[PDB]
Design a protein around this ligand. Structure first.
Ligand SMILES: [Zn+2]
Ligand SMILES: [Zn+2]
Lengths: 52, 56, 111
């Protein structure tokens, strides 16, 4: 591994501490009374595709 | 020798100006473990120290 | 931006009607209740950009200590402009410049 940069980068990624806060860009809370559907039109397609 | 020293100092100032433009247009490479401002400051300091050493 | 009671002036808190399955904003010192229009009850931004270009005033062209450039204004196409870097001053702030013309005062960049 010492003489190969790719494996070294793999090890470096495996060691470094990473939390959800590191990758999270924003968080939101919504009111949505239908578990099988949604109010947001943007996320409607993905949730309906998941439910089907 | 004074014209050589003046030319070296002017060249270093031109290089620092180019680095400033590159940093202001987001074209500057970032040294790992350092922010954009820190990398910019380190590069400028290194350029100026090299300028003084060359003139001396 | 959050609303307040129209007769008590106190802050209206979100509430849910069990029988109606609707979101409502209800005051706590009064029985006033108003229907909620948007479902976004709460939003928190981990990475934010506000405060970067919002720091604009109409009379920023009267400052003599500000450098004057010759960048072309997209709106007025004037030959005189004043530029400054980001007002937000976090440790990881970019060094991009914001150019303000003396007629339209539109903020733009060279990117
Ligand atoms: Zn009230
Ligand atoms: Zn103008």
């Amino acid at each position: 591994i010492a003489l190969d940069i790719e494996k070294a980068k793999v090890i470096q990624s495996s060691i470094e501490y990473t939390t959800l806060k590191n990758v999270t860009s924003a968080t939101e809370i919504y009111y949505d009374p239908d578990p099988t559907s949604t109010v947001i039109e943007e996320d409607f397609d993905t949730v309906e595709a998941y439910f089907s | 020798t004074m014209k050589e020293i003046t030319h070296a100092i002017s060249s270093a100032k031109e290089q620092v100006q180019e680095i400033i433009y590159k940093a202001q247009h987001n074209e500057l490479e970032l040294k790992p473990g350092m922010t954009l401002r820190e990398s910019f400051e380190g590069e400028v300091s290194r350029t100026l120290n090299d300028a003084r050493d060359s003139a001396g | 931006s959050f609303r307040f009671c129209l007769e008590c002036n106190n802050m209206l808190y979100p509430k849910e009607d069990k029988e109606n399955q609707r979101l409502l904003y209800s005051c706590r010192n009064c029985d006033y209740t108003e229907l909620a229009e948007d479902p976004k009850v709460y939003r928190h931004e981990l990475i934010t950009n506000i405060g970067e270009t919002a720091g604009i005033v109409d009379d920023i062209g009267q400052d003599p200590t500000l450098p004057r450039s010759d960048k072309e204004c997209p709106e007025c196409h004037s030959r005189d402009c004043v530029f400054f870097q980001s007002q937000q001053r976090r440790k990881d702030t970019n060094m991009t410049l914001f150019y303000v013309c003396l007629n339209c005062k539109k903020t733009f960049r060279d990117e």
